[PDB]
Design a protein around this nucleic acid. Structure first.
Ligand SMILES: C/C(=C\C(=O)OCCCCCCCCC(=O)O)C[C@@H]1OC[C@H](C[C@@H]2O[C@H]2[C@@H](C)[C@H](C)O)[C@H](O)[C@@H]1O
Ligand SMILES: [Zn+2]
Length: 880
RNA sequence: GGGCUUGUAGCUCAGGUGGUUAGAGCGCACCCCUGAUAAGGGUGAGGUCGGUGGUUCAAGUCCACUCAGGCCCAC
């Protein structure tokens, strides 16, 4: 054959990647050479960019949401590291909380039998047993970071940071004591947490209590009377107010009885429940609960409380739009009340019994002594209204008895104080988008308060012991010694010994002048542990900085790690943790709905790296618009596979068609190239311009677009093909071949670097197969630089490339009739046209036949009617 | 229900300041190559823009309303 003495592409680079068998090994080497540090070595000094890592929970195996997140930060960090910045990424992990605990007994722990320390550990091995578990994944994603020496909220040094924050706050009047409502089961004498309760049918005594309106102000609007629906009985004796829904009300008002107030929404309902339609005799003088939102009335039981009014959000259906609110046994019931200095009624024993506030209620039952109780004061109190029924009332599993809301000693962070100091910061913090500022600027402006304590045994205990019988020791020195103590031993040294040997060595407080000391139990709400990232790590690892440049997490972090971090950061350094703040949506299924086993639509991470590899996973995340929930489906991945396939294949062609090329020696001066070679050079420039800018705005999707378009249209659909007649024929060192190779070497490599952060594996691969590249690893190479572009040229070829597209519809037609079949078989002839000056135009170009990969062409100035006219001239096609 | 939010071709995405026959790539259909071949080229067919009603001479692009989703509170 005449191909024996031909030129061909040669490289071991496979067409089919097989990343799953490939990626691992490639990692182990980066892990070998220890890139991460050397990454910092390279740069070192220079500028610096910090992307503080939000610590994911140390429990379970990573779901897609992580992948997106971590791959987005990896993109961000790598790129940066490539522009030279000293960007040390430091992975984090959440090790405290309650799941991690529930995930113990749900296996077979058997609580009571151990000891706090006897489980802290047994709820700490697991933690670390997870970190490793989840570490491999993140690593498996080619993500890059201090994984060998990450940070974890349970490290002795971390609590240090943990308590000081609290402390600094404390010593600024913010971390006080108080009371909030909490699920409770007297059949355990302790509290519970949602996950600890299931619901069943309880026989509740539905009642529409006849309440009376009164008092001048509470008389501002006529003087009828007040109804009120509540399915529980004892709730009432713990009275504080009534809140309608300002914006929909109509306090009705009506006949005989004593006239009654409710909402229009219920009017009928009410009557349909109290045999009231004893002639549906309409309403009179209807008010506006919206405004009414501040009246006053006194309720039966003993009404030695002027139950005011307020504006709540939602209360439709049920009974009278009255509600009856008691911030003691109702969560949302707790806020609306509280919002305006409203009490905290009857605590009610560790058992179903109360004491204070209760008249006869002193020694009662939580149930039956709430029942016949309802009675007595019903009639003999102002007469009322009653029903019986079955509900959906909560119960404590494991015991299966009932549970009830109760008041309980708790701690909080004065949000009210700080709100503002925060918001102001919120404003002076930048965002990838915009709605995020809003959303969060609003979270805070409605935040309310921060219950910062749980009765669990796994977490930084709040540093507070008592001594004065009034007690409450919590000031500097006392606080610190705890940190200056927690280090050498850990959050363990609290549950270790007694309050005594944990205070300021030989210290003594005026109160409890008996040397006796009682230390608090309550540990902190994990959002604190995590909220203290800017503390325990950003400001404590010599190679970082406090003002992290940008936090990057998912939309549910706007209240989570975002707020709890800034909320905390401010209350210490009165400034924002992060400078920039980028957010990302969730991962839905195909449609765009939630992923869940019960449906069978959950593309899990691992299962994918194992199938299509991770370089695919990455090219996917890049294909999405994270500014909103992103979609993943097996249909999606194929196209993602497809894409990666083309890309891979394309570097493959170049890799082998530069196999014999060698810059140092061969390359041609730009000044000395074939115009067409220049053209693409520039097109590699334009592309480099537009992609580095894209990288800068964290707009990858935009690259997934360009890279793609560029590859198909510019490379394969053209340059590469046209190039075949050069790279395969002309003497191995003919000025023509070497010219094209000179640009290809660049149209390549330079682009190899541009993809480095998104195709971490494949990048490195193409790198290993590229001659004389001067540096082991694409990931330790500065990115190509952005050079000015000879537009005027780019424009000519845009026109020429147009004309091309025409030269084809002219060919296909001709190729359809069989007049031709493989372009090279035809002789093209176009000429000036009244719609285009084809003649004088095609003057500059050369090898028009070659550019059109045909046999021949000729510009004639004129052609005849017979000649099928096109957009860029008059064309005609003919065999040989 | 509350704050914020998403809905354009099979798929991922574009579509200043409202304005001719709504774009890109992939994919697909078909023809060509078989000297990049578990590759390659060419051509073409697919959206009336979630729905409805308005605003304007004119709306995918502004208003309202509505259906379906999503994160977070309320439950
Ligand atoms: C985009 C995400 C989830 C998602 O898109 O959800 C994907 C779908 C869930 C998987 C379904 C599994 C099947 C179960 C079934 O049957 O339904 C959220 C991200 O997660 C990773 C990180 C988690 C840590 O919490 C964050 C922080 C900073 C705080 C300190 O802890 C990240 O910060 C972000 O939160
Ligand atoms: Zn049941």
């Amino acid at each position: 054959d005449y191909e024996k003495t031909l030129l061909m592409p040669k490289t071991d680079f496979p067409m089919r990647g097989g990343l799953p068998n490939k990626e691992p090994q490639i990692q182990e080497k980066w892990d070998a050479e220890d890139q991460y540090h050397k990454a910092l070595e390279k740069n070192k000094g220079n500028e610096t960019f910090i992307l503080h890592d939000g610590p994911p929970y140390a429990n379970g195996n990573l779901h897609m949401g992580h992948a997106l997140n971590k791959i987005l930060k990896d993109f961000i960090v790598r790129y940066k590291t490539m522009q030279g910045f000293y960007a040390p990424y430091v992975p984090g992990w959440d090790t405290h909380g309650l799941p991690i605990e529930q995930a113990l007994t749900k296996k077979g722990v058997d609580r009571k039998k151990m000891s706090t320390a006897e489980f802290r550990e047994k709820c700490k091995e697991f933690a670390l047993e997870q970190i490793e578990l989840q570490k491999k994944d993140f690593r498996r994603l080619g993500v890059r970071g201090d994984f060998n020496d990450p940070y974890i909220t349970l490290k002795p040094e971390y609590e240090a940071a943990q308590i000081r924050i609290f402390g600094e706050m404390a010593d600024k009047g913010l971390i006080y004591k108080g009371k909030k409502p909490v699920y409770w089961s007297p059949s355990s004498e302790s509290s519970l947490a949602e996950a600890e309760i299931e619901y069943h049918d309880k026989r509740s005594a539905s009642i529409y209590v006849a309440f009376n309106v009164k008092d001048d102000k509470g008389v501002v609007d006529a003087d009828a009377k007040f109804i009120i629906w509540t399915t529980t009985p004892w709730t009432i004796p713990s009275n504080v107010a009534i809140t309608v829904h300002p914006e929909l009300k109509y306090g009705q008002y009506n006949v005989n009885g004593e006239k009654y107030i409710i909402a229009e929404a219920l009017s009928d309902a009410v009557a349909e429940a109290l045999d009231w339609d004893k002639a549906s005799i309409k309403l009179e003088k209807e008010y506006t609960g919206k405004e009414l939102e501040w009246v006053v009335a006194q309720h039966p039981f003993l009404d030695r409380e002027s139950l005011v009014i307020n504006g709540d959000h939602v209360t439709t259906d049920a009974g009278t739009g009255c509600v009856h609110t008691a911030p003691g046994h109702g969560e949302d019931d707790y806020i609306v009340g509280q919002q305006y200095e409203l009490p905290v009624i009857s605590p009610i024993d560790d058992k179903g019994v109360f004491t204070e506030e209760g008249g006869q209620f002193e020694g009662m039952f939580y149930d039956k002594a709430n029942k016949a109780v309802t009675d007595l004061l019903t009639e003999k109190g102002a007469l009322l209204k009653l029903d019986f029924i079955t509900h959906s009332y909560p119960h404590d599993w494991r015991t299966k008895k009932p549970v009830i809301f109760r008041a309980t000693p708790q701690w909080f962070a004065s949000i009210s104080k700080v709100r503002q100091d925060i918001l102001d910061a919120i404003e002076n913090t930048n965002f990838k988008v915009n709605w995020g500022k809003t959303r969060i600027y609003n979270m805070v402006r409605d935040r309310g308060e921060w219950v910062i304590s749980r009765q669990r045994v796994w977490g930084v205990p709040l540093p507070v012991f008592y001594a004065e019988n009034g007690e409450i020791i919590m000031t500097k020195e006392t606080v610190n010694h705890v940190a200056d103590l927690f280090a050498e031993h850990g959050s363990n040294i609290w549950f270790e010994r007694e309050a005594k040997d944990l205070l300021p060595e030989g210290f003594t407080h005026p109160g409890s002048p008996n040397g006796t000391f009682t230390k608090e139990t309550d540990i902190m709400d994990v959002w604190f542990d995590s909220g203290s990232s800017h503390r325990g790590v950003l400001e404590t690892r010599p190679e970082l900085s406090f003002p992290a440049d940008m936090y990057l997490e998912g939309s549910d972090q706007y209240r989570g790690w975002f707020n709890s971090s800034i909320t905390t950061s401010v209350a210490t350094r009165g400034v924002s943790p992060y400078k920039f703040l980028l957010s990302h949506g969730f991962v839905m299924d195909g449609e765009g709905k939630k992923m869940s086993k019960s449906l069978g639509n959950v593309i899990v991470p691992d299962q994918v790296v194992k199938q299509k590899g991770a370089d695919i996973a990455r090219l996917w995340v890049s294909s999405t618009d994270y500014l909103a929930d992103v979609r993943i489906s097996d249909e999606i991945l194929k196209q993602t596979s497809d894409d990666y396939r083309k890309i891979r294949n394309t570097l493959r062609f170049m890799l082998g068609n530069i196999n014999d090329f060698n810059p140092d020696t061969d390359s041609i001066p730009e000044s000395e190239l074939l115009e067409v070679d220049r053209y693409l050079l520039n097109r590699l420039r334009e592309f480099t311009a537009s992609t580095i800018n894209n990288y800068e705005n964290f707009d990858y999707l935009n690259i997934y677009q360009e890279v793609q378009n560029f590859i198909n249209v510019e490379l394969s659909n053209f340059y590469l093909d046209y190039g075949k007649d050069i790279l395969y024929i002309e003497q191995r060192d003919s000025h023509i071949r070497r010219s094209m190779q000179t640009v290809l070497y660049q149209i390549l490599v330079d682009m190899t670097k541009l993809l480095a952060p998104i195709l971490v594996h494949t990048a490195e691969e193409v790198w290993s197969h590229t001659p004389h590249v001067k540096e082991e690893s694409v990931h330790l190479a500065d990115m190509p630089k952005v050079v000015e572009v000879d537009q005027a040229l780019l424009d000519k070829w845009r026109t020429f490339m147009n004309l091309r597209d025409d030269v084809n519809r002219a060919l296909e037609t001709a190729r359809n009739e069989k007049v031709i079949g493989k372009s090279l078989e035809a002789k093209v002839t176009i000429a000036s046209n009244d719609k285009f000056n084809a003649s004088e135009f095609l003057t500059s170009f050369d090898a028009l036949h070659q550019l059109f990969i045909v046999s021949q062409v000729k510009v004639v100035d004129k052609l005849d009617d017979q000649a099928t006219a096109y957009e860029h001239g008059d064309i005609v096609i003919e065999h040989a």
